[PDB]
């Protein structure tokens with residue numbers, strides 16, 4: 001609603017509407033649809049493919065309004081549009097088409113050639129965005145209808161399995177809508193209107209989003225199994241590669257606080273390659289899927305060391321000790337976050 005129409009698009013909008021309408025009757029003839037008097041899908045002969053004048057003026061207006069909304073959403077996409085030159089409209093080349101491919105209309109709908117016209121990756125990305133929004137407005141119209149999703153298509157029960165996000169939509173519709181959208185935006189370029197898109201933005205979730213406010217879960221051995229002397233080894237296999245920590249915690253570790261943030265636990269975050277105890281340092285490399293990190297503690301001279309896939313992880317210095325010295329205290333137990 002907030003979108004205002006610039007004067008160039010304003011006085012070119014009717015030509016856009018009619019040319020894309022003719023372009024659609026070209027898409028129809030390419031798909032094999034032929035022109036007829038009456039609206040009956042079985043007979044494949046409809047007045048829809050004939051020129052807009054013989055088209056029902058209701059559908060013709062509804063198509064033009066649909067394009068007004070589509071170009072307004074294009075402008076809402078943050079993409080600026082600039083007319084190239086007046087001569088790009090003064091000379092309007094138009095491929096000739098075979099009579100079987102060509103409509104009864106004398107002048108060929110086919111605008112300046114798609115070979116000459118070029119599509120950038122950003123332009124294709126905004127084509128995808130526009131296809132997304134068109135399906136959204138198609139769906140909201142259905143919700144106003146009261147149609148609700150159904151795996152089986154139903155008209156009496158108004159259950160369309162096409163009421164899913166465009167990401168999960170079936171290929172055939174995605175292709176047909178994409179074709180009309182991208183040939184439309186290519187006609188936009190061929191009219192000299194250059195669509196300079198906004199810069200692509202990068203954002204990272206970093207596992208902030210979570211079901212339930214809880215950010216992480218800690219699994220540990222029982223307190224009674226604490227080891228106060230000897231040399232011990234246990235493995236941790238990482239099915240994924242994310243915010244995961246493994247190491248040894250005291251029987252006083254808190255299940256709400258992250259490992260290594262306090263003095264209770266000594267952990268290794270392979271995600272950021274950091275050893276964690278009362279802070280973070282740099283230690284080791286980053287793991288991948290199906291990586292086995294073995295944690296080893298020798299409580300005799302108070303050392304702890306980690307081996308990712310067998311090789312010994314190292315800090316910035318060549319030392320193999322993740323934590324050089326620590327008090328025995330009340331023992332250590334295997335712990336993971």
Ligand SMILES: Nc1ncnc2c1ncn2[C@@H]1O[C@H](COP(=O)(O)OP(=O)(O)OP(=O)(O)O)[C@@H](O)[C@H]1O
Pocket residue numbers: 048059063066138142145147160162
């Ligand atoms: N003959 C046409 N002329 C113009 N645009 C059309 C035409 N057919 C389809 N469209 C466009 O493509 C969309 C396809 O909607 P369509 O009515 O085919 O969906 P549907 O799944 O059959 O709907 P419902 O859920 O009500 O059964 C329309 O919203 C419109 O934008």
Ligand SMILES: COc1ccc2c(c1)CN(Cc1ccc(C(=O)O)cc1)CCS2
Pocket residue numbers: 024138162173176177180181
């Ligand atoms: C530019 O505007 C138009 C004008 C005409 C047509 C399309 C888009 C493309 N679309 C594709 C499509 C197919 C199935 C569904 C559906 O059943 O959900 C929705 C859209 C309708 C077929 S011709």
